[PDB]
Amino acid sequence: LRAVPGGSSPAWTQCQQLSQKLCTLAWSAHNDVPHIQCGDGCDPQGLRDNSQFCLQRIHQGLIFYEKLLGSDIFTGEPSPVGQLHASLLGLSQLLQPEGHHWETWQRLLLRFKILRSLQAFVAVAARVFAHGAATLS
Amino acid sequence: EIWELKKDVYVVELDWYPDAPGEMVVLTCDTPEEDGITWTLDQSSEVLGSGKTLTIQVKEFGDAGQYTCHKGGEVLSHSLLLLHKKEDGIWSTDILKDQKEPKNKTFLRCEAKNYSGRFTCWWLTTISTDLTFSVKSSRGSSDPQGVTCGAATLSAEEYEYSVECQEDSACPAAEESLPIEVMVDAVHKLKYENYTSSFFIRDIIKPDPPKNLQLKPLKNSRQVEVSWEYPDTWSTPHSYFSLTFCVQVQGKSKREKKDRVFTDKTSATVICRKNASISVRAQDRYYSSSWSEWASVPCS
Numbered sequence A: 001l002r003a004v005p006g007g008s009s010p011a012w013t014q015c016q017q018l019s020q021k022l023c024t025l026a027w028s029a030h031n032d033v034p035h036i037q038c039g040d041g042c043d044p045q046g047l048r049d050n051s052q053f054c055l056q057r058i059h060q061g062l063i064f065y066e067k068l069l070g071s072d073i074f075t076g077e078p079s080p081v082g083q084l085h086a087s088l089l090g091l092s093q094l095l096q097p098e099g100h101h102w103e104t105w106q107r108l109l110l111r112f113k114i115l116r117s118l119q120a121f122v123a124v125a126a127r128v129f130a131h132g133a134a135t136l137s
Numbered sequence B: 001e002i003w004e005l006k007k008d009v010y011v012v013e014l015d016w017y018p019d020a021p022g023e024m025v026v027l028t029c030d031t032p033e034e035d036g037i038t039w040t041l042d043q044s045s046e047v048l049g050s051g052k053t054l055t056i057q058v059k060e061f062g063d064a065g066q067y068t069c070h071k072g073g074e075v076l077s078h079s080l081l082l083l084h085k086k087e088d089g090i091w092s093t094d095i096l097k098d099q100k101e102p103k104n105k106t107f108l109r110c111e112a113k114n115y116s117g118r119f120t121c122w123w124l125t126t127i128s129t130d131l132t133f134s135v136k137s138s139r140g141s142s143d144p145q146g147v148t149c150g151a152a153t154l155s156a157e158e159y160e161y162s163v164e165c166q167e168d169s170a171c172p173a174a175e176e177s178l179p180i181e182v183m184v185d186a187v188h189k190l191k192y193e194n195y196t197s198s199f200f201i202r203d204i205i206k207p208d209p210p211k212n213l214q215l216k217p218l219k220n221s222r223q224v225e226v227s228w229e230y231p232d233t234w235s236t237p238h239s240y241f242s243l244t245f246c247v248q249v250q251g252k253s254k255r256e257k258k259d260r261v262f263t264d265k266t267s268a269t270v271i272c273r274k275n276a277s278i279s280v281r282a283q284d285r286y287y288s289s290s291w292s293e294w295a296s297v298p299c300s
Ligand SMILES: *[C@H]1O[C@H](CO)[C@@H](O)[C@H](O)[C@H]1NC(C)=O
Pocket: B011, B013, B084, B183, B193, B194
């Protein structure tokens, strides 16, 4: 028998808090978008076996959304968007393990569509981080 | 504008204006023969025509019904014709009563107690008789994925019908990208109507009320510890499918004090007072779906 370092643990309690914050913010504002799909490992059972899959997919969605909120759609025509953008980044930064390099008008309508879709995604993320924080630790 | 609804049932699309010319329909008997054939409508022995085909005019709901062909005393085939009336570009919706709540033109209301893939839809009608409802559902429209529904049955009374459906391949924890479609066929005598509903399960979530709501008075103080549990219908594990709560303390009167607290815990300490009740309701923690009904308990 041996015992071997497995690397840095995900920061579950911080991610739990940032993802909860993001849910609050996304609802404070009343295609090929990534979605946490069923294959993605984010379900309760999928988290025990291997959470890297899920977290990696969550990271991907976070960076997709942060690019959208920083883009022309939100800084052009006529707010929780500033704090939302920054928190999207904060969380994605927490997910990025050392060594891994996981980084790669009509507006009022688009902005409604994007924010609605963001609410959905961040709720899944919040459940993942809350479950991980509670059962993996 | 004429299509098969089910075996031997055909819907005729009827564009109507007061001087309706009437659309002509040709009905063919479902038989290998063409001799000795007569036609009757519904329960009458009156011969309306002879031979393998019958040509009829449809202008109004009485122009329809179960046309039947006969040879040697024997029924060869039945063809029931229903009419879907398009007033002036718009189809009729007399059968179901607008609920007027989520938006206007909302005839079907669906809700789910959890993320399992089971949901319930209901609808309202004034009509008490000669009523059949048929329910279909799927996830997506491009390549529909299976959802199994039961029979629509009278559930309460205005007339209320409900149906239970279950997504065949549920993924409770996923972020849904394609909505569930609900299609209800509504038949009143010979009047056919369509009803449709589109949604994400996440948006029709309404949990059941908090369970086992109970009070625990503090020693020689007015304060009470309120405690409760997640409903049994709620998705498990709770560590993942979190709920959040609203605790309310209110009197019977108008101008009396009110106390309202938000908490992710399943306990709270409130101040009780004679003739006040403690109410607790629930909502998904991370997504702003519908609050449960109140569970409540008198300060007694
Ligand atoms: C409902 O009615 C309309 C017109 O009759 C038709 O186009 C549509 O296909 C019907 N829907 C179903 C699901 O049968």
